């Protein structure tokens, strides 16, 4: 099994070769009467490589006393966009390639999803169980202090990012580290963390946000008839069946939103063990029943399911939180019509390739996961703002629907309204108790759905210019490559 | 011929003598209780002149070597206002007076619509034919390094503006520069120059905006009653008759926004030649004539126009990229009912004196040409927000739409729907293409249409105010005048 | 033969494991009541590793066209001292590793002669010789650039040194870049960087210091008694036999001045041929016959050296731009009773040992190459002050000379003066010539050759307290070890 920094080298040439053989072809053979495609492949050569890399060996005081040092790698990939987000990681085994392979990826899927920013990461080589909660903060509030003195961390420059391992506990130590360190004097500095707390300006619905991008992102390629009769399947809006991999915090709000939306858990796979019903899996009562016990075995009117839950006649199949557990072996036996990767690297290339030999439809884990980050840059947005999303429009946008109503009803009295009294003033009743329950949650919500389809279409625009049929991840890797490529072209170079 | 510069200290003067006239006598008389003619006459004194005027001479080395030293002049007119905006422009025989006057006639410009920007402008001493490419990137890099040093170019003080000279590249390079000379760590750093391309945050239409703003001026001119009647045409929404001088891009906008409204090109004149037809020309096709041949000349199912384009029979008269081509002895010619400026200095004031005499209406090109400054201030306030216009708030409004419909769908069914079924769901064709095609273009048209009306009815009412019945550049100066008059008057004076 | 890298890092364990074998015994023990060894191995662990390294990938365009990426690392030791002192090298094959043992090596070579300096090393991994003029200016541009956003340039943080490799061309093109992209606006911008040209505030005598080190460094160990003594060989003032391999700058200045102090260079020693005499060899005639010829051979008067020019029996041995030339085999062989380091790392640390069993003097490299770290401080002292040394004191202390010399004139006159007339008033000649000729050039010379008085003074002192004999390069790394320890020790940590 290769390292998935090898597997994003390799994406990021596949999709490289292709982008230059098409660039050349259509515009930048009018960009310059020379010849173009060394041009071409010097721009791409300078897109390559991770621009900065900087490791810091700081001190640190043990709670019983050892004066040791702590390695931390902090990667930017590029400064083409001036404000980069990256994300923090305190994990053992940590490596300066792991931070620029992962500053690359996270550049990658923010241009996948045309947010405006540079990909970053941290990395800190240390474990967090060993140590106590002081000496995380010690440790949080050392390194943040480093970086800040090397103009790293900052609202203009980088913006931390919440990673699984960290919580928002850590980010309100940044955020104060920061504000000690730099000063407050700045309005912008209140936007320099993301991942901040509620009271604080951090967004709403952050946690449910990219299990949200997940149901979106599945329901963007149900509803495309073409992709949904390559396949052969009818389009499955409620009669689909999914299963998924792990009980990840994504995949529990992916698979109660997917219920929501009608369709049916057959059976849910887990490392700890596999729950296998008929029809379907109630999302309350599994989560309930894992929050309790702490294992889905031994959920009522259900039977643990036998054998690997890959293999399973599920219409859908969602690994999450997992690395290679479908691997070159697993793809001719696993039948499921479509892999939706809710986790990085959930599938090896080469499991791809007999994917697209038997027509399995893969959706790339870069257009899905990314819900987090937009909702990361939706929260960046708000604190800048340093306004509620919504705040100064609601009661506006309400009267201004009360007001149409009242001049239908006014209208249909003067016009149908000789005999008896016309009621359409009356609004319906859900959207009676949206406009009452209206908040900027709901804006968040349409904007994270709205980016998600536009993500979904020029993926599948990109999709048929350079005909990869089935071969999604490739597309959008095209996709992402091609717009960098056309914002360091047109950016001046000094 | 006078020059443009004691044309615009003329209309000063002017519009300073009749609103000194008002002002001692409604507001600035209980102001304070001494004498207030004096009081008056020395803020005019004050606003009259322009505060800065920088000049540089850099050293440039050419592609051959030659190590000789180019003159470049910056003025700023005030800082009434913090942030201005400046037109850069690289032409021969620029000089210091060329500036100041050109600052001036921006801060009108810009204080007309309402735009809270001071005026500046920047004259490079230069013929941009001469020199190569790479040696006009290091001319803008040079004086943008050395304009930056003194501490004049930068999102607080002066954002630089694409004059008909300079491209977008040089604004890049310009963006570039400022990023290296000062850095990227300010937020606002971003918004630093305005035309930039889209890549890099630039706003969709800029080139058409002009000329589209010249579609809206004349409409919000023709709509008018009051004036078409004292003209004595009847207000032309489609049986008006138009022709337009020179093929510039905003003449170009205009002819096809004025054929698309209904309005009809009978003739088209250029310098290079003229093209009369019976009934009108078609945009498109005259657009592809153009492009390919180089001239207007030899269209298709037309024959030239012989003799002056001036003198024709048009009910509107549109003189674009033109100077001084209407002179004192053309305006008794001309039978134009009305003549719309699209360039600066189009007419003299002998020929505006005579218009008035002949009832011959001018529509100041102050007000007309000021849909560019209007559009690179959104683009301003855009990059500012870091947002694309209405991102977050399309699909809310979408949905907001969707459940008024069903509401009124509801509503019907209840009192009206006792036998069969009522659709009020369904949208309109053109609003559902709306909806699906919502963008932030359509954002920036709305804004700009919304601009200019304002600006037209604030015209009219200050040419009402002051009884200039056909005088409207007067009104649109007086107006200018005023505001600036405001805004010196109630702010603090050290 | 081990990289120099474990030569350093190995020194610095053999020094450390001997200063905590003290340290504890005196004053840490009374430091704190608790356990001290493990609080004096953690300081020891904190010391040892480089605090900051950062790596730059950035674009340059050839003069064909090529766009292609260069990477140079930047390695700052530690910042417990704020002005950093870093050498930039433009070598290919240069390592992190490189640039992290260098930058050690410097701050622990500032520390041996008291220059409050930490230690840096830029490495840039590129071959000069390839490169036109052109493209090595504009890769110095862009490195400078790239690490003044990173804000590790800068005269409060870390100051440019040059190398052998680089000129002072380059250290122009690097101020006028930091001038450039950070500002002139502060006072201490001006002494950014040393190594600057005369007319930019550069020191005078800088290309003769590190020589004239040698020659001041050999003579604080040739004056002491018991060194000698222990050696066996009376003092050689004037009687003693010298020899130096290659024929660098250093060596060359270490020769003349050896000369002028009175030693006889028996024979030169160079890769291209040696050359032997009886006597001596004049520096000015071989320095004469070098220029023009190119090489040493067929001097005048002269016999070439056949042999090795390690084995001759000389008093004093000087490898100079040596690397390992003196090896474990070597050490045995040679006879010469000391040896001198010009260059770094000579000698292998088998090849010490040896010569510490046969008791042949080494006198460390670390001692004798810091006059142009001294000379360098001194510069940015002075760019500091913004006035040449002694400007307005010069002719005050000539008056006061003369003042004296007339009292002492009076009062002869005045007791002994009854018959004739005393002339105490002239001075000497070479006094009244030096009050005639003093500048700047005699206060460098005078700082320089105390500071290496002192610090032979402190090895000595310190050679003596931890009872090495003869092993000076141990007690020269210990007594900086020493000191970083005070430094850190009893400066407060966060």
Redesign the interface.
């Given at each position: 099994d290769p390292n998935f920094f090898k597997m994003v080298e390799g994406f990021f040439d596949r999709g490289a070769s292709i982008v230059e053989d098409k660039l050349v072809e259509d515009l930048r053979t009018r960009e310059s009467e020379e010849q173009k495609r060394?041009?071409v492949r010097?721009?791409l050569?300078?897109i390559k490589?991770?621009?900065?890399?900087?490791?810091?060996?700081?001190?640190i005081?043990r709670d019983d006393?050892?004066?040791?040092?702590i390695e931390g790698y902090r990667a930017q990939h590029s400064?083409h966009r001036?404000?980069c987000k990256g994300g923090i990681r305190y994990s053992t085994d940590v490596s300066v390639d792991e931070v620029k392979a992962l500053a690359s990826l996270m550049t990658y899927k923010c241009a996948v999803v045309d947010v405006?920013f540079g990909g970053a990461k941290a990395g800190v080589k240390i474990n967090p169980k060993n140590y106590t909660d002081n000496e995380l903060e010690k440790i949080t509030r050392?390194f943040t202090?480093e970086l800040a003195?090397?103009?790293?961390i900052?609202?203009?420059?980088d913006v931390p990012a919440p990673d699984m391992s960290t919580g928002e506990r850590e980010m309100s130590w940044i955020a104060d580290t920061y504000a000690s360190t730099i000063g407050h004097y700045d309005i912008?500095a209140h936007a320099c963390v993301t991942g901040k707390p509620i009271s604080q300006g951090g967004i709403h619905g952050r946690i449910s946000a990219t299990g949200r991008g997940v149901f979106h992102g599945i329901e963007n390629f149900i509803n495309e008839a073409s992709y949904m009769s390559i396949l052969g399947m009818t389009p499955g809006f409620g009669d689909k069946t999914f299963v998924v991999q792990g009980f990840g915090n994504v995949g529990l709000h992916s698979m109660r939103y997917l219920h929501r939306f009608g369709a049916k858990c057959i059976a849910v796979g887990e490392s700890d063990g596999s729950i296998w019903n008929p029809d379907g899996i109630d999302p309350k009562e599994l989560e309930d029943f894992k929050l309790q016990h702490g294992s889905i075995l031994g959920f009522p009117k259900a039977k643990p399911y036998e054998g690997s839950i890959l293999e399973a006649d599920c219409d859908i199949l969602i690994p999450a939180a997992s690395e290679k557990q479908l691997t070159k072996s697993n793809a001719p036996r696993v039948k499921a019509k479509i892999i939706a990767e809710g986790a990085n690297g959930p599938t090896t290339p080469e499991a791809d390739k007999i994917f697209l030999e038997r027509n399995i439809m893969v959706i790339p884990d870069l257009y899905l996961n990314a819900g987090g980050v937009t909702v990361s840059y939706?929260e960046w947005?708000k604190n800048?703002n340093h306004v509620s999303?919504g705040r100064l429009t609601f009661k506006y946008?309400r009267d201004s629907?009360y007001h149409?109503?009242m001049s239908?009803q006014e209208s249909l009295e003067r016009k149908?309204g000789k005999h008896?009294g016309?009621?359409?003033?009356?609004?319906?009743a859900?959207?009676q108790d949206?406009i009452s329950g209206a908040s900027e949650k709901?804006?968040?919500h349409?904007?994270l759905?709205?980016?998600m389809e536009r993500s979904a279409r020029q993926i599948m625009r990109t999709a048929m210019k350079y005909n990869l049929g089935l071969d999604l991840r490739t597309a959008a890797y095209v996709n992402a490559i091609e717009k960098v490529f056309?914002?360091y072209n047109?950016?001046?170079?000094?």
């Amino acid at each position: 099994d290769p390292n998935f920094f090898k597997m994003v080298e390799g994406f990021f040439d596949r999709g490289a070769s292709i982008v230059e053989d098409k660039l050349v072809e259509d515009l930048r053979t009018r960009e310059s009467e020379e010849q173009k495609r060394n041009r071409v492949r010097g721009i791409l050569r300078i897109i390559k490589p991770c621009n900065h890399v900087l490791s810091l060996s700081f001190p640190i005081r043990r709670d019983d006393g050892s004066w040791e040092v702590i390695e931390g790698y902090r990667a930017q990939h590029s400064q083409h966009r001036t404000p980069c987000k990256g994300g923090i990681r305190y994990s053992t085994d940590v490596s300066v390639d792991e931070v620029k392979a992962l500053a690359s990826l996270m550049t990658y899927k923010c241009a996948v999803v045309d947010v405006p920013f540079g990909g970053a990461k941290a990395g800190v080589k240390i474990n967090p169980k060993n140590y106590t909660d002081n000496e995380l903060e010690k440790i949080t509030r050392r390194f943040t202090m480093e970086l800040a003195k090397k103009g790293f961390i900052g609202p203009g420059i980088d913006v931390p990012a919440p990673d699984m391992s960290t919580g928002e506990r850590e980010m309100s130590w940044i955020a104060d580290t920061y504000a000690s360190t730099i000063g407050h004097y700045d309005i912008n500095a209140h936007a320099c963390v993301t991942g901040k707390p509620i009271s604080q300006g951090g967004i709403h619905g952050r946690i449910s946000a990219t299990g949200r991008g997940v149901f979106h992102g599945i329901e963007n390629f149900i509803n495309e008839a073409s992709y949904m009769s390559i396949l052969g399947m009818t389009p499955g809006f409620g009669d689909k069946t999914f299963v998924v991999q792990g009980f990840g915090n994504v995949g529990l709000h992916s698979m109660r939103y997917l219920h929501r939306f009608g369709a049916k858990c057959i059976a849910v796979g887990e490392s700890d063990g596999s729950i296998w019903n008929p029809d379907g899996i109630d999302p309350k009562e599994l989560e309930d029943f894992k929050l309790q016990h702490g294992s889905i075995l031994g959920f009522p009117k259900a039977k643990p399911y036998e054998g690997s839950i890959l293999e399973a006649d599920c219409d859908i199949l969602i690994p999450a939180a997992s690395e290679k557990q479908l691997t070159k072996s697993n793809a001719p036996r696993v039948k499921a019509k479509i892999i939706a990767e809710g986790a990085n690297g959930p599938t090896t290339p080469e499991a791809d390739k007999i994917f697209l030999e038997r027509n399995i439809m893969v959706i790339p884990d870069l257009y899905l996961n990314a819900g987090g980050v937009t909702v990361s840059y939706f929260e960046w947005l708000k604190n800048l703002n340093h306004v509620s999303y919504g705040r100064l429009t609601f009661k506006y946008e309400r009267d201004s629907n009360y007001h149409l109503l009242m001049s239908v009803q006014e209208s249909l009295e003067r016009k149908f309204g000789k005999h008896g009294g016309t009621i359409p003033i009356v609004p319906t009743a859900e959207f009676q108790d949206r406009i009452s329950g209206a908040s900027e949650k709901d804006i968040v919500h349409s904007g994270l759905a709205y980016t998600m389809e536009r993500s979904a279409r020029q993926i599948m625009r990109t999709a048929m210019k350079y005909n990869l049929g089935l071969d999604l991840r490739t597309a959008a890797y095209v996709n992402a490559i091609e717009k960098v490529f056309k914002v360091y072209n047109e950016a001046g170079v000094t």
